[PDB]
Amino acid sequence: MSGAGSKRKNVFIEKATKLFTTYDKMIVAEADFVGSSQLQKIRKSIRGIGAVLMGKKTMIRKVIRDLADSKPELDALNTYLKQNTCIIFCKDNIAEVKRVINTQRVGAPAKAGVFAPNDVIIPAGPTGMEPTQTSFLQDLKIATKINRGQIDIVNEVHIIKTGQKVGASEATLLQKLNIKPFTYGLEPKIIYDAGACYSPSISEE
Amino acid sequence: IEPSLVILARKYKCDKMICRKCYARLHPRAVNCRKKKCGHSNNLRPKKKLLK
Amino acid sequence: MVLNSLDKMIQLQKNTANIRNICVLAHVDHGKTTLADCLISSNGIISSRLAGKLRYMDSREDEQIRGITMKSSAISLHYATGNEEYLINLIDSPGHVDFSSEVSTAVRICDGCIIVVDAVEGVCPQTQAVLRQAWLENIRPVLVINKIDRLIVELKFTPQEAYSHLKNILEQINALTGTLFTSKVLEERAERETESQVNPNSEQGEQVYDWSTGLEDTDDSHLYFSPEQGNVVFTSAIDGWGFGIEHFARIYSQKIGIKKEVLMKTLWGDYYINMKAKKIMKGDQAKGKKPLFVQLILENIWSLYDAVLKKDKDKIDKIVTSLGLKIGAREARHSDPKVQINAICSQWLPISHAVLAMVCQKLPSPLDITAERVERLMCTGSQTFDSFPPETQALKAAFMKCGSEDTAPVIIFVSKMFAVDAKALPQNKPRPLTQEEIAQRRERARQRHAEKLAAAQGQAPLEPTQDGSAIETCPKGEEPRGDEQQVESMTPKPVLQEENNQESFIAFARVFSGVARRGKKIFVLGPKYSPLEFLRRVPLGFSAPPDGLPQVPHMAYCALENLYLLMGRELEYLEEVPPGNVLGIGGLQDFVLKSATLCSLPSCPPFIPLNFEATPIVRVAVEPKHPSEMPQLVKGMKLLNQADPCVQILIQETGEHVLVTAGEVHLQRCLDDLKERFAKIHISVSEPIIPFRETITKPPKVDMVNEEIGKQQKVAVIHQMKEDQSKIPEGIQVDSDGLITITTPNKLATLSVRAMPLPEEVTQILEENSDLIRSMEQLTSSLNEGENTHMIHQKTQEKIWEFKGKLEQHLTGRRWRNIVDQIWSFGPRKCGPNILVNKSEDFQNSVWTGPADKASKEASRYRDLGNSIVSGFQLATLSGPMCEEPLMGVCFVLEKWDLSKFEEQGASDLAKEGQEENETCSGGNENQELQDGCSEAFEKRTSQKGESPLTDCYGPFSGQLIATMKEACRYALQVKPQRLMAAMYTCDIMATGDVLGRVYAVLSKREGRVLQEEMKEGTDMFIIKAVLPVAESFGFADEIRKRTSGLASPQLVFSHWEIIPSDPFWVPTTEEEYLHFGEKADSENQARKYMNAVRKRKGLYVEEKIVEHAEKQRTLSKNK
Amino acid sequence: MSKAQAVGSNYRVSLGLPVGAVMNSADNSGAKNLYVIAVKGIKGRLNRLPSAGVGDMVMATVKKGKPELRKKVCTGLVVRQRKHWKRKDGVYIYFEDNAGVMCNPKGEVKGNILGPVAKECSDLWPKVATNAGTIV
Amino acid sequence: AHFPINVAVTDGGRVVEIRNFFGEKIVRRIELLDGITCYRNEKAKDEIVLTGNSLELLSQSCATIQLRSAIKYKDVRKFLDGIYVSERNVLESN
Amino acid sequence: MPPKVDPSEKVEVFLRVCGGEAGAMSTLAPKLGPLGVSPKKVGDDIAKATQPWKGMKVSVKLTIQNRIAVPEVLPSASALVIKALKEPPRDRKKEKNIKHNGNIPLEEICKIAKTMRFKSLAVDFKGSVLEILGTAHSVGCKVNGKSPRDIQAGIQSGEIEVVEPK
RNA sequence: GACGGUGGCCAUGGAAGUCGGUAUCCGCUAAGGAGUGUGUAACAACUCACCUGCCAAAUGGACUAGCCCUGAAAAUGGAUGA
């Protein structure tokens, strides 16, 4: 790395000290565990309502931004930076801000690898594998006992138990059915509304 | 398996760094010969790689 | 069979259409051991495999693993089984590892062959070369799969992997199929399945009872993805095996009662019997149960192996019993672990009971498949065939029934002859002449005479032992010598060795002939038979004796007392062969010449002309060592012709000390042959080969040549052409920046020339050499040409009705038809690209009409000056821009040559000349009884009038004139811009996805560029097109193989020659020009050394004369 | 070269003479004499002849024989040493006079071996055994 | 699997021995240090496990074993074969 | 899906370099090449017919794999439009030779055609899209107003501002 | 986390950041070079540059000269005098 995390401050104080938290409303959502591919596309709905802002080093210089703005910093005793997160600027209503990103929440292809929920069904990856291979793979639900030169595995469902949520799921078994459940990330940590912090909710109140 | 084991094998032998003095295989991210006779040279070829 | 004799076989061999020719074959002799081992046991005239493996057959496990170890041999393997004969014969064709003529030759010695294809690698130069010929011929070749007991014994896997192996093999073969033909629909058949018998009435009806299911051929009648009516096999030999699908079926049949045909189908792909009571329920034909091989048949084998490994005496027996065959004798006689197996696999091994039937089913007659193999190789030529209307006298009716005649006339075909002065067993002695005695010997010299031989050997000089029971007994082939005649017969006399001296008439070859007898005549044809030559490669067809048509007129006959391959050697007993056979010429004949097909007919359309070239033109102009053995080489090359189809011995184009080959190492092999297995001399090799074409890029500038392309003002094209040479030998007088003329006499007789480019298509045809030597010289004495006049024009456009030079024609309007007569030296070889431009009726006794070349056109007379021109400008076309080599890729132009020049330039050179000849000026019109000046006028018809007052007998002497023409021309070329037009073969390389990049890398390394790629329809295989020079294309296949695992298959097609950047120079011979100093790297390249030992080539022309002539070594240059 | 002994080397070294001793060719090829240059396997020490084999291969020459075979070195095979030896047995083979044969560099004797051949030699070189009816 | 590497053992005595190894027809016995057990849920004639309490000693033993399954002549990119520690610093779940 | 018979079977979208006819397309793309049973010659018709004088060298060509049932849609890039604008004989039969002979604007005639083709990507549209268009090709040079391969947030060749519709 | 215009233009079935070559520009973002390597026929994948999480206070280079080491081998046994 070698720097202020990786490089000198005078690149990330330019889009942090200049772009404030100065807006109608804000929601602090965890969405850095998802790929930029589909995040940048679903940023089209986000940039209409406002934008994403600030590098998370200046989270303790946010106090001098909450003196300028009418809203305070610590409303429910949190600085609102404990994990990898963002701040989505918002001008939606109290109930509709809780479903502004949850209606379009989705995972994407990763660069350093992330888990997916194995409670929901695993989509069908490669189809038309070897018969011997199929036979060998007893962990698959619908398995065969060697059929002809070529045969389908026949799997459009989860190949392992339902219960394992995102974080503690088997990533090694998602390589068997290559296409995996993209239904993680872009979730609220807290729902702020200028001096009125609600709990994180997937749906509207 | 054979790819997952050949890599392992390589890691234990072929993918380390030799000296340009003692030829002594150090370790994959080495930086000095680690010998008295050399004088910890700080001159290090990575040991060669081949398909045959 | 343990017992068979030649008395029974000779009678059954006479009849035809129920014999069936079969042959052994492989890609590099891979899976040869397996095939042979099983056959030896079967054969009875060699007394089984106990007294077997004689008459040259070396079995090896290395080969199986993967190994060539090529060899040329033959075992006499006839079978008197039932009521028929079976001419199999163990053909072992060595072939060659790279693509060639050799491969084409050797491999074509087989009728109805079984082919081992893909060892553990496919899409190679090995597989697409030897078997390239075999799968092209529709001769119903059967799919022989590699060893399966490797998967049981050596690697140690379950029989379930057998299926996988089979699948892999199929996949490998798919690629091969997609080189020729098409393989989009055959990729479905490159799998393992049996989709029939899914219904309830089939699953418990024909699985319990017999019934019947079809095993006939589908779609293709080759070796691609078919059962071939139950003759597909899994050929093994670790303790000897002779088995396949049929064997597997048989065992299955024995368990409850299912038909063999049905079973075979099941066993080709996968089939799923549940094994409750051999009745099946559906649900297992979409999901599965367990395949057949691991359930039964191979399972038993596996078990047996396991038993052996552990060492069990009764367990093995039990296993054997289970396997559905007898248990044998040796179970409590020895300890018998492997011994038992061996014992069983001598009883099991005679495949003649099973395989013969299958063969019959496959192939009803050899007469049928002969019609489909004429159109697949050369029979008229590469253009037309005998099956088409061109060349049809009595061939189509003949090769439907096979052979030329039913009474045996004999023919020839090359398949490389045997090595002389080593084997010389065909003799004129009583015991081979008597055909019965020899036969008797053959049947008795396996394990019967062996004992006798042994007795003779050990106990003739007396006392081998000291105080022992050897001399006491003194055996005469009784109790002691009876032992050691079952594992291998010690000293049995295998090939019936030479009792009397050598008289070498040995030959390998193929001939298809009818019922041949002893004392049969054949009309021998000469060393060069013209009629035969005239028949092949054209639609002509006729049969007449010599009436002066050939070179040698002859009315003599040669004997032919036998037909032999040398399989049982000597003059054989089995000579009554049917229409179609694997044997070649016999008797006292080893003549398999190119222009002499040995036949009973005095002349006939040749059934097979000699083989075609894989890559056109591989040559080397070698010379021999020690003085008396110079013609020895030539003599050897007559024998070399017999062996390999191409060698420059007949018709001199490049002289008789030159090889002609197609291949990478073929040339090398040829070179070694004439030190070793023909003439026993030793010769000077030279591996630098193939001189490239020397193309001039553009004309010269304004000096003494006003008709030109403007300027030559460049620094360098790739290397410098201005400051490297010229400008001071004869450039001090005239020309500053270069030299395109001469000043030896100094404007008494001078000239100026130009070298333009010529279009490439035109060049190609010229360099092919359609014109003859008589087309360019002596048309008054011989017949005056007509058909040849327009052809020349169509190639190089120049005529006597062109008085605006070569420039008009080269640019505008290509392919005209006019007369190109009155030409002296059309090219370097007199059939090449260069031409001397007529742009005048008469300058001043110069540049009109050849020595005797005429178009029926004269300005005043045919007389002119053709003697000094024709010899001079021949030498101008043979010394290039760097000295030596022919001008190729060029159309030459002569601006002017002027004799009788009364002008002159005052200088020292001129003065010297004056002093020498004592002439006030040049001439021809005048004389003082001094000097020379030879012309066409004197030899043709005396004095010259009309075109000039007096005949030319004055001016610089003739020799000098001749010299000077060469010089100026040489100078001009040297100063002109030039580039190396490298020789090229385009590489249409059959490649797969992973090995394209690697292939490209090689190309990059060794010059050239990838133009484009063509993809095969519906397969992973492609074919990449890329130019690559000829010199670097040698050792290419080997390199490719090394690079990966031979996954790309090269094949070098000839696609002309191209201009690529390399320094086109070599140190000038003249020392005045070497004062400039041509550099040691750039003006003496390693690519540009093809001249010191790569240019001794002359059937036609290669003359280089020493320049400048002027009386004596004191009077040559005094003031000069 | 060659080399192939035996099993064993058929035990100890014995000679009739080292370097500079004539023995007859005992061969149908027109070599009439065999004169030693040196013996194969002799590593040797300071001042000591490279000493004759019991049945072992030698660098030799045709000193008096065919002129074609004359000059040019030749690997040979000693067959009988005039000067004696004991074997692992308790016998002392001893001969009239020294003898050997000219041979191939794979050991092989050319024509047929004349006269008596010690069994050790035969054991050493199977070709020798093959090409004689006297092996005593 | 060309010459399948075949390792056998005794626990209590705590020794490992290598029969077949690159065609070696010898045994390479190597005595493990005290406090080292060895089980093996093999998948396709592969994997041995060695469990122990003293990190320092078990590891050493493993290393020794690894060393023993090595050829000292010819190339190392030739044979890529022997015993090789896939997962060290591994701790069972209690 | 698996290649066993010819399409319709492998029904899926694939980006292709189809467009040229003597260098940029000899026979098919490198993705559809190494595959099983499918006609590899019918990919010649989509470039030869649809792009006779359009962009040849490494074109942005989408084609749905149904085989003799393809839309021949042309989504294009900023280096294709320029090529299209330029005359036929200098584009094609010049695919193993370099070319730099374009001076046609994409800042006015191609300006408004950018948003109609691309309406759902990571980039912002109108304000942002005009600048990317203004520099995404090396063949065309344009008139004074915008220029390729130099900064578009300062001096350009006349325009100093971050965005100004020329 | 390490995106898009985009397979930029070339060469080139193909080489898309990465056979190789050139120009090397912008959008959106805390964040991402028409790209450091590995790798891929080539794409991808990974890794880097580049950005944030956590731990929680020091860190990074570049030289300079003191002692020690490397260099640093010869002949009877062996000399800071021991």
Curated annotation (Swiss-Prot), chain A:
Keyword list, A-Z: Phosphoprotein, Ribonucleoprotein, Ribosomal protein
Domain of life: Eukaryota
Disulfide linkage: none
Post-translation changes: Phosphorylated.
Biological process according to GO: cytoplasmic translation; ribosome biogenesis
Keyword set includes Electron transport: no
Function: Ribosomal protein P0 is the functional equivalent of E.coli protein L10.
Oligomeric and partner information: P0 forms a pentameric complex by interaction with dimers of P1 and P2.
Family that this chain belongs to: Belongs to the universal ribosomal protein uL10 family.
Protein name, as recorded: Large ribosomal subunit protein uL10
Part of the full-length chain shown: 1 to 205 of 305
Swiss-Prot record, chain B:
Location in or out of the cell: Cytoplasm
Top-level taxon of origin: Eukaryota
Summary of subunit composition and partner proteins: Part of the 60S ribosomal subunit.
Function: Component of the 60S subunit of the ribosome.
The protein's name in its UniProt record: Large ribosomal subunit protein eL40
Species name: Dictyostelium discoideum
Lineage of the species this protein comes from: Eukaryota, Amoebozoa, Evosea, Eumycetozoa, Dictyostelia
Residues included from the entire protein: 77 to 128 of 128
Curated annotation (Swiss-Prot), chain C:
Reaction catalysed by this enzyme: GTP + H2O = GDP + phosphate + H(+)
Enzyme's top EC category: hydrolase
Gene3D superfamilies: 3.30.230.10, 3.30.70.240, Elongation Factor G (Translational Gtpase), domain 3 (3.30.70.870), P-loop containing nucleotide triphosphate hydrolases (3.40.50.300), Translation factors (2.40.30.10), Yeast translation eEF2 (G' domain) (3.90.1430.10)
CDD domains for this protein: aeEF2_snRNP_like_IV (cd01681), eEF2_snRNP_like_C (cd04096), EF2 (cd01885), EF2_II (cd16268), EF2_snRNP_III (cd16261)
Superkingdom of the organism of origin: Eukaryota
GO cellular component: cytosol; ribonucleoprotein complex
Keyword Nucleotide-binding among UniProt keywords: yes
Record GO terms (molecular function): GTP binding; GTPase activity; ribosome binding; translation elongation factor activity
Keywords linked to the UniProt accession: Acetylation, Disease variant, Elongation factor, GTP-binding, Hydrolase, Nucleotide-binding, Protein biosynthesis, Ribosome biogenesis
Residues annotated as binding GTP: 26-33, 92-96, 146-149
A Gene Ontology biological process term: GTP metabolic process
Residues modified to N6-acetyllysine: 528
Disulfide pairings: none
E.C. number: 3.6.5.-
Tissues where the protein occurs: Expressed at low levels in brain. Expression is highly increased in glioma tissues.
Membrane-spanning parts: none
Regulation: GTPase activity is stimulated in the presence of 60S ribosome subunits.
Comp. bias intervals (Basic and acidic residues): 438-452, 475-484
UniProt xrefs under InterPro entries: EFG_II, EFG_III/V, EFG_V-like, EFL1, P-loop_NTPase, Ribosomal_Su5_D2-typ_SF, Ribsml_uS5_D2-typ_fold_subgr, Small_GTP-bd
Region Disordered, annotated ranges: 430-496, 907-930
Polar residues composition-biased segments: 920-930
Family: Belongs to the TRAFAC class translation factor GTPase superfamily. Classic translation factor GTPase family.
Protein name as it appears in the record: Elongation factor-like GTPase 1
Species assigned in the record: Homo sapiens
Native organism taxonomy: Eukaryota, Metazoa, Chordata, Craniata, Vertebrata
Curated annotation (Swiss-Prot), chain F:
GO biological process: translation
One Gene Ontology CC term in the entry: cytosolic large ribosomal subunit
Record's keyword terms, sorted: Ribonucleoprotein, Ribosomal protein
Matching SMART domains: RL11 (SM00649)
Protein family per UniProt: Belongs to the universal ribosomal protein uL11 family.
Pfam families: Ribosomal_L11, Ribosomal_L11_N
InterPro entries: Ribosomal_uL11 (IPR000911), Ribosomal_uL11_C (IPR020783), Ribosomal_uL11_C_sf (IPR036769), Ribosomal_uL11_N (IPR020784), Ribosomal_uL11_N_sf (IPR036796)
A GO molecular-function annotation: large ribosomal subunit rRNA binding
Annotated PANTHER family: 60S RIBOSOMAL PROTEIN L12, LARGE RIBOSOMAL SUBUNIT PROTEIN UL11
Domain of life: Eukaryota
Gene: rpl12
Protein name: Large ribosomal subunit protein uL11
